[PDB]
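Dear Dr. L.,

I hope this message finds you well. Following up on our conversation about the binding site, I have prepared a predicted three-dimensional model of the protein together with sodium ion. For your records, I am including the exact sequence and ligand specification that went into the calculation, followed by the structure tokens. Please feel free to forward this to your student if that is useful.
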Amino acid sequence: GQTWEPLFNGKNLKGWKKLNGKAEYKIVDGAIVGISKMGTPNTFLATTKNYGDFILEFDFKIDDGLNSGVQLRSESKKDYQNGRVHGYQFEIDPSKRAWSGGIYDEARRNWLYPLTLNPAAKTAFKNNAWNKARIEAIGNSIRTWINGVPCANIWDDMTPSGFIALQVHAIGNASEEGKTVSWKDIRICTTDVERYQTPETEEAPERNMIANTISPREAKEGWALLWDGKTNNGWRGAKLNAFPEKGWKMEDGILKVMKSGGAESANGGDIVTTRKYKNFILTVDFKITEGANSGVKYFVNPDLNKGEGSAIGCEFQILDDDKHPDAKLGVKGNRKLGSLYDLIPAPEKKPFNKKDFNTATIIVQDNHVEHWLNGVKLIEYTRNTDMWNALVAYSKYKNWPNFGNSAEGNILLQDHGDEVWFKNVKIKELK
Amino acid sequence: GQTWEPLFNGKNLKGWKKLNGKAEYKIVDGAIVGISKMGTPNTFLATTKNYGDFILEFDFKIDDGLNSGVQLRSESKKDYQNGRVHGYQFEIDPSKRAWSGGIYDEARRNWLYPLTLNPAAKTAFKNNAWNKARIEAIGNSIRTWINGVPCANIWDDMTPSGFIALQVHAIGNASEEGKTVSWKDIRICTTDVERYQTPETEEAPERNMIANTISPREAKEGWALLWDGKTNNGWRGAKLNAFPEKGWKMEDGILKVMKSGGAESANGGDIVTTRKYKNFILTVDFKITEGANSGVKYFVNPDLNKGEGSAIGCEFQILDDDKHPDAKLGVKGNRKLGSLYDLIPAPEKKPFNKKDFNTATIIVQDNHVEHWLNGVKLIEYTRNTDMWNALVAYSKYKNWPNFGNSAEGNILLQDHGDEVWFKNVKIKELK
Ligand code: NA
Ligand code: NA
Ligand code: NA
Ligand code: NA
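The resulting structure of the complex is given below.
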């Protein structure tokens, strides 16, 4: 049957090495017990072997008010932060936050898969009890389970192989000196991994960490890239037959609208998809600069505006609400980030992290439309209704016949003369 | 079993008399054949007997481009239009309008039950073929069927007994000169009518013609009067504790708002229900004067406006679109008759008969609302939505917090200083 190799023999610490911190690892009833300390940094008991593709299993228990984790495909390099342990980590969190089984990129990218991405896994961890963990690291796929509950699922290629390590996190208050985290029955399967892998029917939804790519899961699910992360393929200027020769830069897997005078579509101009879409889920990652303005448009007719300014369509406003003057204009905030520009305001409380990339989601299912920001629904509307047409009649789009009522339209990225970054521009066409 | 009496014996015209016009009635293969003429008015072949409660059955055929009908409980009085045949008539309509089986009040009230009130019955009549008809006139209930399809259902007490007559409608163009209508197998049942009557499960929805009353059907169906047709009971001034002492008159079963300077709620002021309603079907019959303005409001809070003008609520606009200046003042006609005033425009083409009474219907089912005019849906909307709140934010109601979003409110009739008539103010409370 399945060939399992023990990583810990229940007797001694053979096959392990302590890195960074000076916390103790004692053996109590066939379990590795990591003991908290004071004045020492994070400690890691790392395997003396590197593992690429594997199925890892271990039992774990932790004192409340303590944080722990198990490093996967992790490294310690003398050239990077004096051998500080970095890489994927299976979170052990007994706090009310409840992100156990989540993936944290230790001393590197930080949170990759927090349990906000899969909230039903928050109930998996049993406080002050033994918990059974399973990790499946197969190619670029890293998946985690706690007590049979799927927790995290990331698609990433940064480190294909590295060590497994047990974390004893540095403590801050005196009230946690002898507080322990314990690991037992640590075993690994490295032979016939594909024979014993968990099916796609019993996993957490995947998060693809490899910018501007379509994972096998995303492909099976009907996703395609609108931007390939390298070329202007699939895009043209709204009023041009080809891509603009200025005002748009592509570098480091980021599609950047250039900073100019902040004027509307006066630099390189807006860019549109070279094809039309009907029903879809459109996802766009964006990062703004101070006082920046841009937007994601859909139901676009690139031939309507032959004059100055932005091409005609419905818009997912992108803005620095704190600085850009347009945020205070319009009616009851209908020009702030995430709004249906000049029509429907985004709520006052929205999950926006101005220092990082944010994800815009636009869903079109015939007449039904939704705007999401970082997995939270902002607005909901229905075109081809008495309400829609009446609302459009009061707006900036009052002169456009049958505005936002057509089945098909192009998707657009706006030039509002400010520096805005884009990546992971993907589409899932719907029935 | 059922006792049937033939109205036509198949051989001669014994039991019949020709009234008004001079068109011919010939017998062809056991059928009465009415022949169209020229220069003669409508002709009626009337039974020499009067019938009150009965079940009438006949087969009928008509040439296309011709109009006919069968008179029920009808009269011919020397004191009434010099013997002009008047009364209920079963319509025979081969035109695209398709109101065969509908009830028309010949030389009296005109259309009582057009097939606008039961559009599924429009398919019943077979062109250039024989059609079976059934009429059940039982007390105040007059119901009709064509080929087993229920067509019309009226509740009326104007004429409990009269003759049955076959109509040869006066023709205008020479091309109709020869054209005929035929009626065969004309039989009547006057004995044990209740034993053979069609159940309520197989009829057209009823229209009650008896002003300010609740028919047995309406009562069973949960309808009640908001105005009893005689007293101010159930009504008070919007800003008063009692009914206004001026500007509102009750006479002849009509509720009248008096003509003054055309100012908004400056005469007797608006009148409101002394009760609040939640979910309902509200019906109002109204008649306007030239350049008149009024309205039916719902979701009313009589305590919001303590100043000048109309009380606060959503409004079914009542207006003379042709003359009143406010018709040109909205956004894309949102202040014209039937509109949700200043919010949602009624369509450009609406069934409004400015010389007669018209029926306004307002349906509230929690957040969902509809406006109907004379059995035709005008607009439909949903409050407590992003679209609603955004649309309200652009309107005259932009300063009212949570406008039109409350479950309950009073129903109001507007004083807009013009002469407007009301009757049949009824409500069906919903779950
Ligand atoms: Na941790
Ligand atoms: Na914008
Ligand atoms: Na007729
Ligand atoms: Na009005």
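In brief: Chain A has three helices and 29 strands.

With kind regards,
A. P.
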